[PDB]
Curated annotation (Swiss-Prot):
The gene is ycgL. Pfam families: YcgL (PF05166). This is Protein YcgL. Signal peptide: none annotated. It comes from Escherichia coli O1:K1 / APEC. It comes from the Bacteria. PANTHER family: PROTEIN YCGL.
């Protein structure tokens, strides 16, 4: 999942609505207004179900969120009209990547 090509370039600010999943980890839907979601696939909405109004994004230009990137939604409401944000799994990290002296020195030659 990356970027094959940009294309037309039209950056325009506006107002958006951030909905919250009735019961989920941290899923939120985005739309140019609180009207409805008809572009979302019934396969994904199955997890959302009945969205609710938990946060409204104003249209003054200063709109920054920590869940989804308002900029990644701009091309979603202008082309489709809706954008669902889903926080992916971070990671617990560990001690195995790369290789920094992970063995011992000198041993008992058998």
């Amino acid at each position: 999942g990356s970027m094959p090509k940009p294309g037309i370039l039209k950056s325009k600010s506006m107002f958006c609505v951030i909905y919250r999943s009735s019961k989920r980890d941290q899923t939120y839907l985005y739309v140019e207004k609180k009207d409805d979601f008809s572009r979302v696939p019934e396969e994904l909405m199955k997890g959302f179900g009945q969205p609710q109004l938990a946060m409204i994004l104003p249209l003054d230009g200063r709109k920054k969120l920590v869940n989804a990137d308002i900029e990644k939604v701009k091309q979603a409401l202008t082309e489709q009209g809706y954008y669902l944000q889903l926080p992916p799994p971070p990671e617990d990290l560990l001690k195995q990547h790369l290789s920094v002296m992970g063995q011992k020195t000198d041993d008992t030659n058998k």
